Amino acid sequence: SQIRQNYSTEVEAAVNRLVNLYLRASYTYLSLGFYFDRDDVALEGVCHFFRELAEEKREGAERLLKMQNQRGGRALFQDLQKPSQDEWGTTLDAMKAAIVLEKSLNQALLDLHALGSAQADPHLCDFLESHFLDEEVKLIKKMGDHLTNIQRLVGQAGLGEYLFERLTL
Amino acid sequence: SQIRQNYSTEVEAAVNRLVNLYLRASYTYLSLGFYFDRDDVALEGVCHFFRELAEEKREGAERLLKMQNQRGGRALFQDLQKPSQDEWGTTLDAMKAAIVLEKSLNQALLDLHALGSAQADPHLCDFLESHFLDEEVKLIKKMGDHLTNIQRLVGQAGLGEYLFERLTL
Amino acid sequence: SQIRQNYSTEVEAAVNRLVNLYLRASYTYLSLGFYFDRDDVALEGVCHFFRELAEEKREGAERLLKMQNQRGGRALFQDLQKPSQDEWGTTLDAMKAAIVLEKSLNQALLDLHALGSAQADPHLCDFLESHFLDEEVKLIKKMGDHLTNIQRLVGQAGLGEYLFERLTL
Amino acid sequence: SQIRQNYSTEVEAAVNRLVNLYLRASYTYLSLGFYFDRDDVALEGVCHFFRELAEEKREGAERLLKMQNQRGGRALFQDLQKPSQDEWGTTLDAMKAAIVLEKSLNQALLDLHALGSAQADPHLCDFLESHFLDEEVKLIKKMGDHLTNIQRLVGQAGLGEYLFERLTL
Known part of the structure; x- marks a missing residue:
């Protein structure tokens, strides 16, 4: 990269893993939010709390991706594993x-x-x-x-x- | 003092002690307020109540100090003792x-x-x-x-x- | 503390001492300010300068206390010693x-x-x-x-x- | 007086003397103010200070006179003696x-x-x-x-x- 300067391959790789972690967290909060929107759970304020957090984590991942490009690293995406629970x-x-x-x-x-x-x-x-x-x-x-x-x-x-x-809430 | 008139040394001294009492109360309310801001207490309305009172007591002390100077007395400050409890x-x-x-x-x-x-x-x-x-x-x-x-x-x-x-609250 | 993470007991203790230092400085500036409000000193611009600083130092202490709670440390308050001089x-x-x-x-x-x-x-x-x-x-x-x-x-x-x-001033 | 109640003749008389004192002070400040307006003194800010005070003292006397009538006392006016100095x-x-x-x-x-x-x-x-x-x-x-x-x-x-x-000034 013409622009890359003082940006180690170790940091580049760790930034890509952090992107995966933040997208995973976003996915977990999406599952948390819609669980509390179930008719047999029905806690809309809890649903809104976690759905707000899903957006925050997604914006975190995007800021990391923008910074990766600003430093001349290369974004690499991996599978996003499903949240750890189906019911919360x-x-x-x-x-x-x-x-x-x-x-x-x-x-x-x-x-x-x-x-x-x-x-x-x-x-x-x-x-x-x-x-x-x-x-x-x-x-x-x-x-x-x-x-x-x-x-x-x-x-x-x-x-x-x-x-x-x-x-x- | 050129301006001092009808202002006894006994009152002057008692005003200085009252200033110490009001600053002590302010300090106590500061401790009360941040105790209720602890993550394991978490009563924000109680925290706001006592922090408001900390400011009131501090403004009380300042009004006494201003009046002390208006009468030609001399402000004397003493150690402020810590609040009586660490946990409330x-x-x-x-x-x-x-x-x-x-x-x-x-x-x-x-x-x-x-x-x-x-x-x-x-x-x-x-x-x-x-x-x-x-x-x-x-x-x-x-x-x-x-x-x-x-x-x-x-x-x-x-x-x-x-x-x-x-x-x- | 459920929330405490990467926050050593040494830092927690040093934050409490810094809170005491900032409240002491606030108290010193309160004494400086009202000294210059004496009728036999009468420098209102100097009084306003130091009284402004008394508020700044008090707000510093409050920001440290808020951060202490945000990290899961526990605020501990000690006696506030009086300013080093009575006349400035x-x-x-x-x-x-x-x-x-x-x-x-x-x-x-x-x-x-x-x-x-x-x-x-x-x-x-x-x-x-x-x-x-x-x-x-x-x-x-x-x-x-x-x-x-x-x-x-x-x-x-x-x-x-x-x-x-x-x-x- | 039909309205007079709990208003002693001693207070009534002392109020009339205070009215004379306040009008005398007003007169003194009038003389102070115009002295500093002399072309060979020429301190306009000092003139304005004392002329403001002349008005304050006159309004003080009027408030005492209004209160005298409100209580059912009778205003009695005496000669106003000239200020104590001609040049200040x-x-x-x-x-x-x-x-x-x-x-x-x-x-x-x-x-x-x-x-x-x-x-x-x-x-x-x-x-x-x-x-x-x-x-x-x-x-x-x-x-x-x-x-x-x-x-x-x-x-x-x-x-x-x-x-x-x-x-x-």
């Missing part, structure tokens, strides 16, 4: 699964940042810090907040799950 | 601690008013009446109202604490 | 004391950044860089500029101090 | 004379408040507190501030007096 249980179960998912994305971000630091790639480090690391920390705090409120509420579970959907 | 328990526990705190501020206000009356300092008495005594009485009534509603609600405690935060 | 002398003396104070805050920021780098905590490093390090450098440059102008002016000290307050 | 010297001399004058008004206000308290006349006490006592304290603080700045400036007296008039 209660709002509590779903929010726990979502926190687990975001923490695995955050760890991938941190690992890629460590690689960029080891390769002395400051543009990559700045890119992750500006557009991903703070967003992950804020999102995980929000999900933690939600988890705590769901748990406080489902100590009469049906009533609690309805009130959280109506008054928080 | 439930919304009920926190609102009880807050009422206790405001009643101690109110008693300090009343004692300073009694001193000004004993020293025949009508400007001081009017200053306390216009800017502090009514505000304390209104605030304590509001906290009493909140206490009663929290108590009525936590007769299913988790559900009650969530509903109060969502629908009152 | 001339505008020159006060601006020297203020520069000394800001450089000690800056050094604490730099030490915390070094700790985060040693712990491979890029979210912390980015947080300090975005919200604190540039603000400190700009503020210290401004105080240096002010110091130089005060010094040029007080080579007829009373006249110089009045003109600086009227025409710069 | 420098801005420094004039501001010292003005502070002396305001402190004598303040002491008269405080004495009348003490009389009302001794006569258990709360309407009188409230009237003085709302409309006079705070205004006097603020005005005396401002004059103290001005005095300090004039003194700092006239440590090159002609230049100092010009700069104060131009940049403060």
Whole structure:
């Protein structure tokens, strides 16, 4: 590549894997969202929460792909594996699964940042810090907040799950 | 002081102690507010309530400091002791601690008013009446109202604490 | 903490100490500001300068406290020690004391950044860089500029101090 | 008087004397203001300062006269003695004379408040507190501030007096 400069093949490959992770997360949130739109689940506020997150993760993947091209790397796409569950249980179960998912994305971000630091790639480090690391920390705090409120509420579970959907989401 | 007139050294000293009390209360409310912002507490309406009060108490201290200078007294600052607790328990526990705190501020206000009356300092008495005594009485009534509603609600405690935060605060 | 990830206990503790430092600085600027509001000092522009800084330092402490909660650390508050002086002398003396104070805050920021780098905590490093390090450098440059102008002016000290307050502050 | 209630003859008489004091102060400020409008003094900002105060004192006297009628007392007017000086010297001399004058008004206000308290006349006490006592304290603080700045400036007296008039008044 005529433009490629200070961009290691290790970072290029790790960026492609992170793209796959973000598209996988988007797919998981798509499944979470439509599960809560089932007539026998019917928690529209929970559906909207996860569908919003599906779009966020997809836009994350696109920003990584744009940056890959800006640095002169080459995007490589792999199969997207299906979400880990077909049915997601209660709002509590779903929010726990979502926190687990975001923490695995955050760890991938941190690992890629460590690689960029080891390769002395400051543009990559700045890119992750500006557009991903703070967003992950804020999102995980929000999900933690939600988890705590769901748990406080489902100590009469049906009533609690309805009130959280109506008054928080 | 060229401007000092009818302003006793006893009142000057008591004003400085009241400034310390108001800054201490501000600090306590700062700790109360961020406790309820913890991910394992997560009651944003309670956090906002106490953070608003932290600002009110700080503005109280500043008004006392401005008046101290207007009368020709000299502000003297002392160490600010840390809040009495590191963790504040439930919304009920926190609102009880807050009422206790405001009643101690109110008693300090009343004692300073009694001193000004004993020293025949009508400007001081009017200053306390216009800017502090009514505000304390209104605030304590509001906290009493909140206490009663929290108590009525936590007769299913988790559900009650969530509903109060969502629908009152 | 359910949300805590890549956040060492050493950083958590250093963040709490930085919160104490910023609240102490806020308290110092409160004392500086009201000193210049004394009827026998009467430099309103200097009072406004330091009172503005008291608010900035308080907002700094609050941003650190918010970030502490976002990462899953636990805020711990300690006694706030009183400012180092009761009377601050001339505008020159006060601006020297203020520069000394800001450089000690800056050094604490730099030490915390070094700790985060040693712990491979890029979210912390980015947080300090975005919200604190540039603000400190700009503020210290401004105080240096002010110091130089005060010094040029007080080579007829009373006249110089009045003109600086009227025409710069 | 059909309407007179809880209004002692001692308070009625003291209100009439305070009216004379306020009209005398108004007259003094009229003389101060036009002295600084002399072509051989020519400090227009000082002239405007004292002429503003002449109007304030006149409005004070009118408010006392209105209150006298509201309580059913009878206004009695006496000769107004001329100001104590024909020429007022420098801005420094004039501001010292003005502070002396305001402190004598303040002491008269405080004495009348003490009389009302001794006569258990709360309407009188409230009237003085709302409309006079705070205004006097603020005005005396401002004059103290001005005095300090004039003194700092006239440590090159002609230049100092010009700069104060131009940049403060």
